[PDB]
């Protein structure tokens, strides 16, 4: 029962824009013990699987941009694109990965004009 | 060249029971923890159990009593079963995996479609 909650459920950026999207949790992802935050951000294009993008909640996966960037720790967790590209058009999802069952956020529909 | 790739029934019938199989390749169940997921326009994603390198097992509490996970490190496939199946099950079902060593740290099935009706 840890709830993945994220806002906003959609928006509209333009190309070169910085994007901001929040991901928050009901209780802290932050395992006193490694002291790392186990929340997972994924894209979703379209007919497609998810992706991992940032795991460990700032640890970009290989392949990924350095414009993708994670950070947060604790409940309340955000994914930037610093300089959003029209390819970035898709749905973010945040994971928890603390706890089982481990749930995911609703999503956040980003779309690019 | 690291790929999961998930076979399945297509369409089932209700109360029917589901099976579905992830078949690995590229790399080691034993260094890699396996995930079943499934997703859905309606419901959302959903985490439905794991099973971890070392043989631990575990299930999304809510839906435990109708769910089963196993493995073959041999034949390198996890397997699923889902029992008392309804309408309300029909979703997208994908195994992923996450480990390290990889090109990648995960790697996410290319998920096998279940119509239940
Ligand atoms: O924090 N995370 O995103 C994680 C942590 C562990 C794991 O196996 C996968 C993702």
């Known amino acids: 029962d840890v709830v993945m909650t994220q806002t906003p459920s959609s928006l509209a950026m333009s190309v070169g824009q910085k994007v901001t999207m929040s991901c928050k949790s009901s209780?802290?992802?932050?395992?006193?013990?490694?002291?790392?935050?186990?929340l997972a951000w994924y894209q979703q294009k379209p007919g497609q699987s998810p992706k991992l993008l940032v795991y460990?909640?700032?640890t970009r996966e290989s392949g990924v941009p350095d414009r993708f960037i994670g950070s947060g720790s604790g409940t309340d967790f955000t994914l930037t694109i610093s300089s959003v590209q029209a390819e970035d058009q898709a749905d973010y999802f945040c994971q928890q990965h603390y706890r089982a069952p481990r749930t995911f956020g609703g999503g956040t529909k980003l779309e690019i004009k | 060249q690291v790929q999961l790739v998930e076979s399945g029934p297509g369409l089932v019938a209700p109360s029917q029971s589901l099976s579905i199989t992830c078949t690995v390749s590229?790399?080691?169940?034993?260094?890699?923890?396996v995930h079943w997921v499934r997703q859905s326009p309606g419901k959302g994603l959903e985490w439905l159990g794991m099973i971890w390198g070392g043989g631990s097992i575990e299930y999304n509490p809510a839906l435990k009593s109708r769910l089963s996970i196993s493995k073959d490190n041999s034949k390198s496939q996890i397997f699923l079963k889902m029992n008392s199946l309804q309408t309300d099950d029909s979703a997208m079902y994908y195994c992923?995996?996450?480990?390290?060593?990889?090109?990648?740290?995960?790697?996410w099935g290319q998920g096998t479609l279940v119509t239940v009706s």
């Open positions: 460990f909640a700032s």
């Open positions: 992923v995996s996450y480990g390290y060593g990889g090109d990648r740290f995960s790697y």
């Open positions: 209780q802290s992802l932050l395992n006193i013990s490694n002291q790392k935050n186990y």
């Open positions: 590229g790399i080691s169940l034993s260094r890699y923890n």
